Amino acid sequence: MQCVLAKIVADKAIWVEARKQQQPLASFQNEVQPSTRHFYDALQGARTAFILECKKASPSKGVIRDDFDPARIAAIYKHYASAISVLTDEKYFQGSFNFLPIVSQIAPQPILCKDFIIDPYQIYLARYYQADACLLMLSVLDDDQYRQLAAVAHSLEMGVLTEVSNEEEQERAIALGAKVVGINNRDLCDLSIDLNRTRELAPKLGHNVTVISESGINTYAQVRELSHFANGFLIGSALMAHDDLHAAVRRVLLGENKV
Numbered sequence: 001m002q003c004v005l006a007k008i009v010a011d012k013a014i015w016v017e018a019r020k021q022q023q024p025l026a027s028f029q030n031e032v033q034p035s036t037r038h039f040y041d042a043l044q045g046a047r048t049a050f051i052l053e054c055k056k057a058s059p060s061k062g063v064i065r066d067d068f069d070p071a072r073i074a075a076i077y078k079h080y081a082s083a084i085s086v087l088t089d090e091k092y093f094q095g096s097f098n099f100l101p102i103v104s105q106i107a108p109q110p111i112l113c114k115d116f117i118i119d120p121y122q123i124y125l126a127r128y129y130q131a132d133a134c135l136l137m138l139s140v141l142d143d144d145q146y147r148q149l150a151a152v153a154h155s156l157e158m159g160v161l162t163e164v165s166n167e168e169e170q171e172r173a174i175a176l177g178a179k180v181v182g183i184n185n186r187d188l189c190d191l192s193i194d195l196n197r198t199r200e201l202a203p204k205l206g207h208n209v210t211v212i213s214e215s216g217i218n219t220y221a222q223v224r225e226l227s228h229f230a231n232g233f234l235i236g237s238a239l240m241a242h243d244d245l246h247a248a249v250r251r252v253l254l255g256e257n258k259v
């Protein structure tokens with residue numbers, strides 16, 4: 001039919017309205033204080049940085065965590081994460097803006113709102129729920145849109161994870177002087193995965209640009225090999241797909257449990 005990300009944005013627009021009508025910016029605007037946490041800093045260092053994600057379901061795998069509970073998840077993700085990602089999209093990943101606060105309190109790491117942001121309202125909306133940073137996608141926006149949204153987040157003391165999926169987007173994120181570039185291994189059109197994208201698009205990125213490899217990381221071996229190309233990883237399913245969540249972090253992130 002058509003790209004999956006395409007369908008998603010359609011619904012994201014129809015979603016903000018059904019909520020902009022309900023909870024307009026004015027009904028909370030000048031009441032959202034900047035973020036008292038630093039996303040950008042949290043990902044700095046020579047040590048592999050981890051962005052653990054709380055996700056319940058996805059277009060690619062359906063329902064992942066049959067028994068979701070953003071409370072118990074952050075209770076574990078907090079002992080290891082550099083940052084914690086939270087899908088705030090209900091229709092596709094069964095996420096919810098309320099999960100953000102639920103975590104920002106149980107976990108001290110900067111919270112990242114993982115959603116398809118196409119409206120400044122959304123940024124204002126997440127900051128309201130304690131979202132310490134947001135995700136802007138160069139495959140869903142264009143320079144002007146990005147600058148706009150980029151400026152907005154940088155107003156509320158919020159970090160910006162810039163997602164690139166190809167060389168053109170990479171070159172763009174560079175021209176835009178993006179500070180944290182997330183390279184997505186998943187082709188959001190057909191939902192196919194290729195970890196070489198990380199290998200391909202990171203070498204050029206130069207310093208003062210933290211590279212985060214996102215999606216498809218299933219094993220520790222992959223973490224270890226790809227740590228040669230990226231500064232960090234954003235891992236969702238490899239963790240959410242297991243009941244014993246702590247044992248999962250040991251296997252996948254620490255190459256523990258002796259495999």
Ligand SMILES: O=C(O)c1ccccc1NC[C@@H](O)[C@H](O)[C@H](O)COP(=O)(O)O
Nearest residue numbers: 058059060114214215216234235236237
């Ligand atoms: O994961 C999906 O199936 C999907 C589908 C369409 C659009 C975006 C998608 N992923 C959202 C994205 O934020 C992913 O959750 C993270 O990059 C982590 O993925 P994971 O480690 O779970 O493979």
